[PDB]
Design a protein around this ligand. Sequence first.
Ligand SMILES: [Cu+2]
Lengths: 360, 128, 124
Amino acid sequence: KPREVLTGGHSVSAPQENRIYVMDSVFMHLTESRVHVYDYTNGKFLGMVPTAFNGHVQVSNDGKKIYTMTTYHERITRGKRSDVVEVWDADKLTFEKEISLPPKRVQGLNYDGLFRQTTDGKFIVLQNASPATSIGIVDVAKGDYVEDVTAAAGCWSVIPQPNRPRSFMTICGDGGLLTINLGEDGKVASQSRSKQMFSVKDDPIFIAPALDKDKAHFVSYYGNVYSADFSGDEVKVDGPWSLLNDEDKAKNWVPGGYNLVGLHRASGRMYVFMHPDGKEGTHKFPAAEIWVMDTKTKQRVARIPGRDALSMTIDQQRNLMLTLDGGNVNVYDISQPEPKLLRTIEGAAEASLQVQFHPV
Amino acid sequence: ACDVSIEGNDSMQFNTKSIVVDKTCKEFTINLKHTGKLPKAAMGHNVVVSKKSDESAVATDGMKAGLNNDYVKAGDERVIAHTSVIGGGETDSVTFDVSKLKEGEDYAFFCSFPGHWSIMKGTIELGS
Amino acid sequence: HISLNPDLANEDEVNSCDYWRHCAVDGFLCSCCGGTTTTCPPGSTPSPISWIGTCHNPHDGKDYLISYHDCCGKTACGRCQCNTQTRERPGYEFFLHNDVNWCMANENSTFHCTTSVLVGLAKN
Ligand SMILES: [Cu+2]
């Protein structure tokens, strides 16, 4: 005769369009990393997905499944290793399928380009290191690791191309970009190398891209900007053009952070985390300010406090930007040139450098 | 005499930091030993000889070559001689003619295996 | 030169993130986890690979080439956490990048702590 009865099997209370994902590496205890799910409209905690050791994460384009990547060990600190890709239901937040991966999936900080998916959502494109690098391909429908893109050896990160069903690029030690065009079977149909874009030693760029529909902008340690137009058959690279005017140089401003840039495609506005008094070793410093650049005019149009943020993400449809300082998620309105701070979700994570909106 | 056994471990190291080729050698042979236990597609090594200021350039072009091309560009003319990349427990050799080393310029030996030339580097010199 | 063997410095500064040879460390200083700047705390396995840094020794005005090997097999030590990026670069120069677990190729990859092994004089 108990009045109440505990029940489970419930779906996320808030609608997808409201959800964002904070990937908590929980570095101090990295074997228990998880993804925290939030309602950006109210900062409410909606749930989570445990990602074991140094897990990475992303949401399926159709916005129905939550793809995660991580490493297990029969005994955690000892025993056979199993690197897998897991497919979780986005609304029930439940495990559904495990996909075997060669024991070399990247193990490091959560940069977006390390765990992405083709534009047509058919394949998941992940990064490998053993330490030799290579890009892995997973057939979502087949639930199997289909291709080991070894031509990407000596390269790093994955920049999907929004204008092609199943193509992506990667930055290489030669300062050029390697394009990989997948065939329907998930294997390398064709490839192409671009001309040098930047100098690996004189002006290294951040792997984090400012992605448009047919072009990607990158910023360098010294405040320069490079580009990769992939509207044509082959990639035409360009740059560099400085983000700094003469006074900005006098104060030594430079870009700093991890997923430190973002692009509001509808306005061509590019966002970057900047910190004055830059020099060797400051490329990962918290953001002292967020700079707003107009890519058409190559000029700064707005600058605001960075609230010690390190990573950001942009939601095109709602014209939003999310900044994260490792533990706090800030919500900005970029419908205007100057960003407008809407709210701060405190303690979204203990140690997170990545945050993403549920697709809409 | 005219023989040299250079080693390499899973620790990205060469036990030699510089090799010397006696001047009365018509040809020189260089044998590489990989003491490590890691496979070659992850942490393999090879030896590439090239003019000092050609190292950086050679190492980069070979990286685009791939393990199948032993991480050396095919027909690269900045390369004097190079060995077949090999992982843990393997060994291989290369034998170039010393008349090939020129007048008044220093050479280097490194590993074109993506990112290993940063530390796995030394000097190969002609002399008595 | 004495500024070269941590073994004899004062652990108080050798455990500082400011210690010169830790200029590119992003982890926990093993010297604070039961080990030394050149040894793994009991039970933790040294990683064959590592990321490399070019640190400037302020005591002998010279630049040395430091190798950062990780100790693995045990969960995060959580002590003396440091995030210094002198001469550190992105993944396209993988062995000069430190946003990747250098225990990746070990029998068991879980990260315990970072070491600051002295390779030699920076060839630059
Ligand atoms: Cu090597």
